[PDB]
């Protein structure tokens, strides 16, 4: 019975290999008073404590707080002893090799796992869609990555990173909801706005046409009930919030949208494989769950690519947790039990064993 832990920039997905869904999905935050709270405990206190993301943009920056999250994952969320289960970890693209060895050292020495394995998140999402070649647009909480993959290997020189994901969209929705007279500023009210975003926001196919439709009627207005029973109404903010994914200038960013970032990373690959990448663009992550985002990406990339290229955007219905689900299917295979890094192999080669067993 192996454990699968998907360490996201904002959300930790953990569960057991062989299950269809992760058992625990909690915020990857550590809170300390303005003495240490992890996950939903750090959000239950709200404003007394200051919150820190130890893996804010997919890359672990604070290894002391990252061990607190992994300890919280094993004992409080999964409710198991990590010394009895092999653990499959996931890593962001362009993760430095010193971080891969640091993860292997912490798992074998701090938690004493019998076996261990590290996988790349984008490759698991592409395999879960039934592909070995393609480009994965993984938009999560803290970071967005466009990862072109050829024959199961990510092309590292063509991987592009965009510091624009769901966390920035939640803050932008809080900002534009104040234009209607509502006030969402506190930490507890940010969790309400995140729930509004995940239920009522959508991507408009034509933004300027949708802004005219919303200004001439009320067919796009939705009501939302707050935890205390108060009802708010939201109008054009439903499609203005995820529009910042395609127009980052709404947030004051100079960067390109997710469609141009996907196009730019395809243009950094060999000319001979670009035709395959245009037809195998796979969406992944929680921020790709807006209704209408695949049709918008299809239209935007078609306008950037040559007219003779076939643009196909793949948005599988289970793409929110496709990294975790791909890892749990892989870790539950009887043929995969030879791929683990054993503690015996770690005692001989040290933490550098991860580079030859997990690539």
């Amino acid at each position: 019975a192996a454990l699968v832990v998907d360490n996201g920039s904002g959300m930790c997905k953990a569960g057991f290999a062989g299950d269809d869904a992760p058992r625990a999905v909690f915020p990857s935050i550590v809170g300390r008073p303005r003495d240490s709270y992890v996950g939903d405990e750090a959000q239950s206190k709200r404003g007394i404590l200051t919150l820190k993301y130890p893996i804010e943009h997919g890359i672990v920056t604070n290894w002391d707080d990252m061990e607190k999250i992994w300890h919280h994952t094993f004992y409080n969320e999964l409710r198991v002893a990590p010394e009895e289960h092999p653990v499959l970890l996931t890593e962001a693209p362009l993760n430095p090799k010193a971080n891969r060895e640091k993860m292997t050292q912490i798992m074998f020495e701090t938690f004493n796992t019998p076996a261990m394995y590290v996988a790349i998140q984008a490759v698991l999402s592409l395999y879960a869609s039934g592909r070995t070649t393609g480009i994965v647009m993984d938009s999560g909480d803290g970071v967005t990555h466009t990862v072109p993959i050829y024959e199961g290997y990510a092309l590292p020189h063509a991987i592009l990173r965009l510091d624009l994901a769901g966390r920035d969209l939640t803050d932008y929705l809080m900002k534009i909801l104040t234009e209607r007279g509502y006030s969402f500023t506190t930490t507890a009210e940010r969790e309400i706005v995140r729930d509004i975003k995940e239920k009522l926001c959508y991507v408009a196919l034509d933004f300027e046409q949708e802004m005219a439709t919303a200004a001439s009627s009320s067919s796009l207005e939705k009501s939302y009930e707050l935890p205390d029973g108060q009802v708010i109404t939201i109008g054009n903010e439903r499609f203005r919030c995820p529009e910042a994914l395609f127009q980052p200038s709404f947030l004051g960013m100079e960067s390109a949208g997710i469609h141009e970032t996907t196009f730019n990373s395809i243009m950094k690959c060999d000319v001979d494989i670009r035709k395959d990448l245009y037809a195998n663009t796979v969406l992944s992550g929680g921020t790709t769950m807006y209704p209408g985002i695949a049709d918008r990406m299809q239209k935007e990339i078609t306008a950037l690519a040559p007219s003779t290229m076939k643009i196909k955007i793949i948005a599988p219905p289970e793409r929110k947790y496709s990294v975790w689900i791909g890892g749990s299917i892989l870790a539950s295979l009887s043929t995969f039990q030879q791929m683990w890094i054993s503690k015996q192999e770690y005692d001989e080669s040290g933490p550098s064993i991860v580079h030859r067993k997990c690539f």
Partner: protein
């Protein structure tokens, strides 16, 4: 803060309920599904109420719905602490979480309600890792399955103990 301490028998039972160890299917049937805590005779410790517990092996055999038979164990005119291991399912995950239940019925004597309420925040600090708390002050606030499901995950909860709401 009444200064009432938590006995080591309660701490051992909680540690065994929280973290599941790899065990034979026989020891899995001996895991506790629910357990009640009460005051000792001298009212100095929180102890295990003897005989008031549900085992995982009982669920599916002698026990059809574990939450209904758990509510029956609660006394009508006395306060109690409870630990319930809830197996529920949301729209995107199957969850298994411990629920701390403070049972303080209005019919209970004033002395029991005062001691259990003033010592609740001290026992809950010793039981680290519990993220769900249900304060029930009447039989109508605890008997309904949808009351527990609301505390677990609100409207996202679609199933409880393997049965749809």
């Amino acid at each position: 803060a009444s200064g009432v301490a938590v006995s080591d028998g309660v701490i051992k039972v909680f540690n065994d309920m929280k973290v599941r160890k790899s065990s034979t299917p026989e020891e899995v049937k001996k895991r506790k599904k629910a357990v009640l805590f009460c005051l000792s005779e001298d009212k100095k410790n929180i102890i295990l109420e003897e005989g008031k517990e549900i085992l995982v092996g009982d669920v599916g055999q002698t026990v059809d719905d574990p939450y209904a038979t758990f509510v029956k164990m609660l006394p009508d005119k006395d306060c109690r602490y409870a630990l319930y291991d809830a197996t529920y399912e949301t729209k995107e995950s199957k969850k298994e979480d411990l629920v701390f239940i403070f049972w303080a019925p209005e019919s209970a004597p004033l002395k029991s309600k005062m001691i259990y309420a003033s010592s609740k925040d001290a026992i809950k600090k010793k039981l680290t890792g519990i993220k769900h708390e249900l304060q029930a002050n009447c039989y109508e606030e605890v008997k309904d399955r949808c009351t527990l499901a609301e505390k677990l995950g609100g409207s996202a909860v679609i199933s409880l103990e393997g049965k749809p709401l």
